[PDB]
Structure 1
């Protein structure tokens, strides 16, 4: 329905919890603990699934495969390994010259993982033959670039550290579209990151000019090589100037959520009207790590400092649900009474949108 209006407590099966993400509609939580282990918690069921002894140095990011059989982890010790969801061991192991920021799996190509190396071009590693394909970039090759798929993963978008954004194909790598961000009034600005959605092909861009902007993944291939920047709403906070660390898109396709760093100010807007509707009242003292809504149902769940805070819509059905012909309501009007006082032989056999991020096949009742 509308934005979440109730508050939920914490979900700490184990004390430490660094990163969190929903799979397709919030099934399981991928906790990368700060001890070199990979823990999986249960969402909407409040439990745990599997603990994996990955390596010694802790990890800093997590994502799952398109077929749900892999647990990719952007390690802090350059362990690009394909941990198995089922058995928990390592299926494929590889090493990259630069660490990884954002790991994602194309919902139509699990072979080519998403890697965001630093001071080097993004690299797609093919799980079928352990081959690395460098994404062709423009100008510099030593910038803090972040690479990310579109809704369908059919085009890949990269952001550099001088003001240039690149558009190319996820598999053909035909770099035929660029974009130059606005240069403010006197000084240029780099790009920190971009973040996408599951409907509408919109995407937020976080830059170094302290202002969060929004574009759509359809006006760059339409304009051609490079055109003039033209965002919809240059949203920002103009009373405290909080910097921005992590912000995701809505679970419906019409809202925008932005996260603070230490001020406990979680801001929300809607794409139709850029007017503030509500603000989150968080208890000061912790640093926010990850935010990602339920991809279907409006709810907010932010991880921070090893714990997690959820603002939700706690619901229990009304007492008047005993039977359709039975109601427990109150009225002061006189009762309106009623005014209107086969044979076949067939057995019974019958038992946002949806994408391909399923088949985790991980559930241990005992």
Structure 2
């Protein structure tokens, strides 16, 4: 539905705060900041020699946190492209995430170690707690306002901490239905409201409302707002994301390189988008204020927009025949 030839080795992308720019990582380890309106590249940053697998914009948009595969995280000013700060860790980093309401702070999910929240002003770090002490794979994310931290382990356990004190404000383990746990693949939140989603190893996305987890307390049984899956193919989900408003949810079937689109309230599947059967789906993102969806597959990015009835359909356009309502004086002088 529209691709870009000007970028190669697309690996990970991230919309800015207003959905005007897109920073995509490349295998060479370069940042390609490409613009939507001019439909061209806005910037090229020599980030790492190692490909970049995690990228996040700052709220003001002037900072981008990038993670190399060399366990090298670095902050870059979008105007200049300089490495503002640079750090390295053990257990290679799985993800970075700016704090949405404090760009000085940034959480980092490493591979084998617990996620740690650092600051840029001071090169300090706060190691977030781990429930089972043996997960070795815990994804973590700020909420919409950056007030709480949601951490999900490979054993389905879900901890909600407060971002400042790291104190356990809520907890619950998700189930595979019967009695078993499932590897929490990812935690996503809505940029609007409080609904969030969890991708798990059961190939079943679970949509909740964080207020219900907060009122559920520690070690409770919160039910999901929704349960979403491909009941037909039972396909895993490499990457999923909400819509900009938060009423549409998309999942990327890397198994068959497709895109499933459900709703939030009803949860019925909006639609499906099919990509090149030969392409391996890698990354998925939604335009924050547009029905536009960016996909990264086999190093190539594709764009999926959604237009209205007009752009040619605007006499007064009607859809179905209209019986004329004759009047009393319809034949009168």
1:317 paired residue among 310, 319, 326: 310
CA contact (8 A) 1:252 1:297 kept: no
Q: State how far apart, in whole Å, the 1-side matches of 2:75 and 2:60 are.
A: 13
**Which runs of at least 4 in structure 1 moved beyond 6 Å after TM superposition?**
319-322, 327-340
CA displacement at 1:126 relative to structure 2: 0.9
Could you say which structure has the larger radius of gyration? 1
CA contact (8 A) 2:212 2:222 kept: no
Distance 1:211 1:129, change over 3 A: same
Distance 1:219 1:29, change over 3 A: same
CA displacement at 1:260 relative to structure 2: 0.3
Q: Which structure is higher in RCO with an 8 Å CA cutoff and minimum separation 6?
A: 1
Distance 1:195 1:333, change over 3 A: closer
Q: Which residue of 1 aligns with 2:118?
A: 125
Q: State how far apart, in whole Å, the 2-side matches of 1:319 and 1:285 are.
A: 34
Distance 1:44 1:332, change over 3 A: same
How do 1:102-181 and structure 2 match up within 5 A?
102-181=95-174
Distance 1:129 1:154, change over 3 A: same
CA displacement at 1:134 relative to structure 2: 0.9
Distance 1:225 1:11, change over 3 A: same
**Superposed CA offset, 1:105-147 (max 9, x none):** 2221111112111222211111011111111222215421111
**Superposed CA offset, 1:180-204 (max 9, x none):** 1125214332312111111221111
**Superposed CA offset, 1:275-296 (max 9, x none):** 2232213231111122222212
**Superposed CA offset, 1:192-220 (max 9, x none):** 21111112211111112222211111122
CA displacement at 1:16 relative to structure 2: 2.3
Q: State how far apart, in whole Å, the 1-side matches of 2:266 and 2:46 are.
A: 47
TM-score by length of 2: 0.89
Q: Which residue of 1 aligns with 2:75?
A: 82
CA contact (8 A) 1:320 1:329 kept: no
Distance 1:228 1:330, change over 3 A: closer
Structure 1: state its 5+ residue gaps: 1-7, 341-365
Count of residues in Structure 1 that have an aligned counterpart in Structure 2: 330
Distance 1:338 1:23, change over 3 A: farther
Distance 1:104 1:337, change over 3 A: farther
Q: State how far apart, in whole Å, the 1-side matches of 2:229 and 2:149 are.
A: 26
How do 1:287-326 and structure 2 match up within 5 A?
287-313=280-306
Is 1:13 aligned with 2:6?
yes
Local SS of the residue matching 1:279: strand
CA contact (8 A) 1:252 1:298 kept: no
Q: Which shifted more, 149-158 or 273-282?
A: 273-282
**Superposed CA offset, 1:128-173 (max 9, x none):** 1111111122221542111101111111111111121111111222
CA displacement at 1:68 relative to structure 2: 2.3
TM-score by length of 1: 0.81
